[PDB]
């Protein structure tokens, strides 16, 4: 099945894409994110390893794009990297989620390009608070050094590291949020309001929190969001009231903060559980989602309701069928419109750009 779809994808790449690059990493990555700086041009990616042994690393890769893929640095990491995210105000600083439940902070510029063969991990900060590992990880883009994390322990932790010397120290969570009653799968700050953030969990809820509230056990809003676990959310960077959630129910839901009683839209086409959803960094109507069905779907909300001649609803702009295994993470390139990096369980990293005629 997979093998037949893939053969058909390969034949069609020149008509569906302006760019496709494929690279098989040594070990699969659970995480992917484009760093914001660009020096053809040179772009960089934060990646991690997931191994059957003890050779784990935080990884920075370089990618040459029209204006090859190489490992620039590996940094010893304690166990697999569940997720890694750079701090928007200083992208030398990367947070990572470890299986032990610690969240680690690295300044990658402080490390040798070849990792220490001893295998020792030497993080610049070790952030304590969780009793279990997890995935959700989010830096506040309006308040430097405030980091949210979501865990399988049912909690969200918040740290404020802005006054802490990055000299190897342990920092406890400033606040712990306890409103969910099951694994918290994802957490994200609002992109314009420094006090607001969302969380989603296996209790099927989206919660909206306000850090100004004295009550850490009850959010400002609690939304019955999906008919199964909610794995990811993303706030729209250009539309202050709009956000999206993705779920084991196979849908992405669209929400408005002004009235969360009613879902705005349900984007339906995935055939299996969704793990990631991200808004386009360039276009306010554009989002993407990926997961267990090995597909990455790109949606355009300006097309909801449009007359068609179907293969899918009109808001489905593009299905990326290049991966042949579950997609673990993906990232929109913030410097070259429509370029995405996606990574899958079978070690494949793809860097691709759909054909201009599709969105044009």
């Amino acid at each position: 099945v997979i093998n037949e779809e893939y053969k058909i994808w390969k034949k069609n790449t020149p008509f569906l894409y302006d760019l496709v690059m494929t690279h098989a990493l040594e070990w699969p990555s659970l995480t992917a994110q484009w760093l914001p700086d660009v020096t053809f041009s040179i772009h960089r990616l934060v990646l991690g390893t997931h191994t059957s042994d003890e050779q784990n690393h935080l990884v920075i890769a370089s990618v040459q794009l029209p204006n090859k893929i190489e490992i620039e640095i590996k940094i010893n990491h304690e166990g697999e990297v569940n997720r890694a995210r750079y701090m928007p105000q200083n992208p030398c600083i990367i947070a990572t989620k470890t299986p032990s439940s610690d969240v680690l902070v690295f300044d990658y510029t402080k490390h040798p390009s070849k990792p220490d063969p001893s295998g020792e991990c030497n993080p610049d900060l070790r952030l304590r608070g969780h009793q279990k590992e997890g995935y959700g990880l989010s830096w506040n883009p309006n308040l430097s050094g405030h980091l949210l994390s979501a865990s399988d322990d049912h909690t969200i932790c918040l740290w404020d590291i802005s006054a802490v010397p990055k000299e190897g120290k342990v920092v406890d969570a400033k606040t712990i949020f306890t409103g969910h009653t099951a694994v918290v799968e994802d957490v994200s700050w609002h992109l314009l309001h420094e006090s607001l953030f969302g969380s989603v969990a296996d209790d099927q809820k989206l919660m909206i929190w306000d850090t100004r509230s004295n009550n850490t056990s009850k959010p400002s809003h609690s939304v019955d969001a999906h008919t199964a676990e909610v794995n990811c959310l993303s706030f729209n960077p250009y539309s202050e009231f709009i956000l999206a959630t993705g779920s084991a129910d196979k849908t992405v839901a669209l929400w408005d903060l002004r009235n969360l009683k009613l879902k705005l839209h349900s984007f339906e086409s995935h055939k299996d559980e969704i793990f990631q959803v991200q808004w386009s960094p360039h276009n306010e109507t554009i989002l993407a989602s990926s997961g267990t069905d090995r597909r990455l779907n790109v949606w355009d909300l300006s097309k909801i309701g449009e007359e068609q001649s179907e293969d899918g609803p009109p808001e489905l702009l593009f299905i990326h069928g290049g991966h042949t295994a579950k997609i673990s993470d993906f990232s929109w390139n913030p410097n070259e419109p429509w370029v995405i990096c996606s990574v899958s369980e079978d070690n494949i990293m793809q860097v691709w750009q759909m054909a201009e005629n599709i969105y044009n």
Partner: peptide, 13 residues
């Protein structure tokens, strides 16, 4: 034990 990661990742050397 977490359902979100496969239990047996494979190396490509």
């Amino acid at each position: 034990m977490s359902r979100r990661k496969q239990s047996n990742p494979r190396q490509i050397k």
